[PDB]
Amino acid sequence: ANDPFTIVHGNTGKCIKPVYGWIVADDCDETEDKLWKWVSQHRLFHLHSQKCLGLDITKSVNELRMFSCDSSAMLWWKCEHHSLYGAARYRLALKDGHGTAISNASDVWKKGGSEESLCDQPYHEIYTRDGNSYGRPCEFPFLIDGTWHHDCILDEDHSGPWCATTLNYEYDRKWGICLKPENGCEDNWEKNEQFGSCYQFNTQTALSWKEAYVSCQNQGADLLSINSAAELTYLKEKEGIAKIFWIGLNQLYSARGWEWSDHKPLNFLNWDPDRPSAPTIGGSSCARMDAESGLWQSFSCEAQLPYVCRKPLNNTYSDTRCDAGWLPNNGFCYLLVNESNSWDKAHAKCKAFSSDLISIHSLADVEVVVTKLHNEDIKEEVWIGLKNINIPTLFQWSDGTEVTLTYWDENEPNVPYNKTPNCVSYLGELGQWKVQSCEEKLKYVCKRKGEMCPPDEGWKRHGETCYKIYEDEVPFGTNCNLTITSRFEQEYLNDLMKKYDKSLRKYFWTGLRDVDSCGEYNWATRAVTFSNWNFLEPASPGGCVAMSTGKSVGKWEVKDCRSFKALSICKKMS
């Protein structure tokens, strides 16, 4: 994974370590010989001795001692609440300052310095470039000449830090250069001042789209997003990089519809008509680039391809007067024309209203047009300001305001090939957006100007209510019991969690709980009218319900109220 730590007994506060390969408790000193990291396959590596903690279960010996890490003893360890279990769920325990392994043991284990359980951080992989491994990640530990290395190696023999990528280096001799995170754009990166960002071109690599996402995320970067024709033309003419590589455009981690993994708006598009927005092969939810044609193809997320990372650099009201009929919101006014008409015609009517066609800049906005202006004919599309006239595509607002939010529906934005202008409408329960033929006579909306949540306390604005993410993973109820009242609040909660945890691994609490083990899930305090259960959920009774990001962003899953920890999202101002 990542960093060394010390293993601290709960009842004595003493740090375990091995002497002559046996586990004894000791007074935490500040040296090396009390340090452990996780290694691959769920092993605890004691750094000083180059041995892995293990448990011999042949016969009933249950001998708890150190082994070579390639040993065939039971070297795997998993956390259960606070205790650490291995084979058959024997738990790591202390007897008389001596390490044992016994059933239903009560001992408590926590990493010193901090006080989290031993499995609270997850195993970070480290991907490579170059070498002879086509990007495959390091296998820790690896063995060269009696020494078991737990991290990358600096040698005069290799360009920079390096690691073996199989479980048997001396035989397979398969290795690569470590892709670790950085500060400047040196040696591992490429400055490009025109775009304000550095580029990493992992040219001879074979990663799935998810492996690729993780390797840029670990480096403190993102998968490439292409935001402009200049950006696109740069990448097309670049020399010496892959002909086909992953980009961050994806329909996997979104609530629905295509998005940039880095959350930059999707307004510049360059779809290959052969593998477009609606994928030919059904279920292809990632997108690659063809640096020869310059086009973007939807593709199976599991294909092993090359990929490109990118990161930036860094620098050195209450209500609103509207004319009657119009709806006030922020400092703007909205009016929904029922008289269906085409796009250019609809634009012209809004100009004749001394307004323009609505530009939408927040889920808050989306919510007000869907729940306030209109509520019945959800099945009819409604025109929105957003339109392209270029090749490659570049949706823009009719009022020249910047494109911040692009709220595409599933398989949108579907641009036709070589066929401008391209207009955008909204339909469905959520106000989601699709591309449309500019002649369709739809209703439309005109937007015209009209007339405490401290940002230090941690608060973020979404209409009237304010939200806040408590940064520490904690048991249920600790900070609040959050009630999710509608599909719109869920949609805004997804944007929050997606923006907070680029790692895809944390969970966030809901207030929903089954207090008795009978089956009713109700908000720990409102009536559960809006549901958002994930597949095959609620799994079981007596639980506490959390959500995450990733494939199922925001979908509810029932956790064990006793052991499960998750971040707190809380709200006030009603």
Numbering used by the authors: 32 to 347, 356 to 490, 500 to 573, 579 to 627
Give the authors' words.
pmcDEC205 (CD205 or Ly75) is an endocytic receptor highly expressed on the dendritic cells with antigen-presenting function and has been widely used as a receptor target in immune therapies. DEC205 belongs to the mannose receptor family, which also includes mannose receptor (MR), PLA2R, Endo180 (8), and FcRY. MR family members are type I transmembrane proteins with a large extracellular portion, a transmembrane helix, and a short cytoplasmic region. Their ectodomains contain an N-terminal cysteine-rich domain (CysR), a fibronectin type II domain (FnII), and eight (ten for DEC205) C-type lectin-like domains (CTLDs). The functional studies of DEC205 show that it can act as a receptor for dead cells and may recognize dead cells through cellular keratins in a pH-dependent manner, as acidification usually occurs during the event of apoptosis, but the mechanism of the interaction between DEC205 and keratins remains unclear.
To investigate the structure of the CysR∼CTLD3 (residues M1- S627) fragment, we expressed the fragment in insect cells and the purified protein was applied for crystallization screening. Crystals were obtained in 0.2 M Sodium Citrate with 20% PEG3350 around neutral pH (pH 6.5–7.4). X-ray diffraction data were collected and showed two crystal forms, one in space group C2 and the other in space group P1. The structures of the CysR∼CTLD3 fragment show a C-shaped conformation in both crystal forms and they are quite similar with the r.m.s. deviation of Cα atoms of 0.89 Å. The CysR∼CTLD2 region of DEC205 has an L-shaped conformation that is also found in the crystal structures of MR and Endo180 and the C-shaped conformation of the CysR∼CTLD3 fragment of DEC205 is similar to that of MR at acidic condition. The structure of the CysR domain of DEC205 has a trefoil shape, similar to the CysR domains of MR and Endo180. The structure of the FnII domain of DEC205 is also similar to that of MR and Endo180, consisting of two β-sheets and two conserved disulfide bonds. The structures of CTLD1 and CTLD2 of DEC205 exhibit typical CTLD fold, and the two domains are associated with each other with a hydrophobic interface as well as hydrogen bonds, suggesting that they might be tightly associated with each other, which is similar to MR and Endo180 (15, 39). Notably, the structure of the CLTD3 of DEC205 is different from the conventional CTLD fold with two unique loop regions (loop 1 and loop 2). Loop 1 (residue E521-C528) replaces a conserved α-helix in the conventional CTLDs, and loop 2 (residue T573-A592) becomes much longer and partially missing in the crystal structure.
